[PDB]
Ligand binder design. Structure first.
Ligand SMILES: *[C@@H]1O[C@H](CO)[C@@H](O)[C@H](O)[C@H]1NC(C)=O
Ligand SMILES: *[C@@H]1O[C@H](CO)[C@@H](O)[C@H](O)[C@H]1NC(C)=O
Ligand SMILES: *[C@@H]1O[C@H](CO)[C@@H](O)[C@H](O)[C@H]1NC(C)=O
Ligand code: NA
Length: 179
């Protein structure tokens, strides 16, 4: 339905900008609306007043709308409509905001007794995990990664986790004399 997809982080702020715009005198009204609830979240009705539905919102002179501290409820299609003094619609841009939880630093666990190693990430939406040993790719996975060996070991393992909004990483030197 012609919207510009946008990714935002649960808990962080985000900015919806219209580069296609450049403010001026002729401009009489800039309206930002939230589709699903059909409600104007912010509006620049000339100096006549600066309306904002909440502190969660902020609208700038350049038409950019900042949404503070993203929450599950903010995933929605947003629309800006802006008009001059002669009543004309100068621009209309639409954004399709989806949000994800930032990923957390992965956690690596292991026993030398049982030749087993695990990498897991507790926080993060639809993450992707990669396991490396002394800089060489082991496995890619969406769920928890397991890695078993047999010999005595003294490697440097690296586990990455990432999604659309973040990337975290953890390296842990492993030494199993096993005897
Ligand atoms: C609009 O202004 C804000 C700061 O007031 C800035 O963060 C944003 O990048 C600007 N966008 C444009 C298109 O000027
Ligand atoms: C995991 O996410 C929760 C909120 O969803 C937060 O309280 C906690 O601090 C996060 N942990 C990390 C390591 O980011
Ligand atoms: C680890 O190895 C021991 C033998 O040394 C075995 O008995 C045990 O089942 C293994 N641990 C797990 C969790 O399977
Ligand atoms: Na919102």
């Amino acid at each position: 339905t012609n919207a510009l997809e946008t990714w935002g982080a649960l808990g962080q702020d985000i900015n919806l900008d219209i580069p296609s715009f450049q403010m001026s005198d002729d401009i009489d009204d800039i309206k930002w609306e939230k589709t699903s609830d059909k409600k104007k979240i912010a509006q620049f009705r000339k100096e006549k007043e600066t309306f904002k539905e909440k502190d969660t919102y902020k609208l700038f002179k350049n038409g950019t709308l900042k949404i503070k501290h993203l929450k599950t409820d903010d995933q929605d299609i947003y629309k800006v409509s802006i008009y001059d003094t002669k009543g004309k619609n100068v621009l209309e841009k639409i954004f399709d905001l989806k949000i994800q939880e930032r990923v957390s630093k992965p956690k690596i666990s292991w026993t030398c007794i049982n030749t087993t190693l695990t990498c897991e990430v507790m926080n993060g939406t639809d993450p992707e995990l990669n396991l490396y040993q002394d800089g060489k790719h082991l496995k890619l996975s969406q769920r928890v990664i397991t890695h078993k060996w047999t010999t005595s070991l003294s490697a440097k393992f690296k586990c990455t986790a990432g999604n659309k909004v973040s990337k975290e990483s953890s390296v842990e030197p492993v030494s199993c004399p096993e005897k």
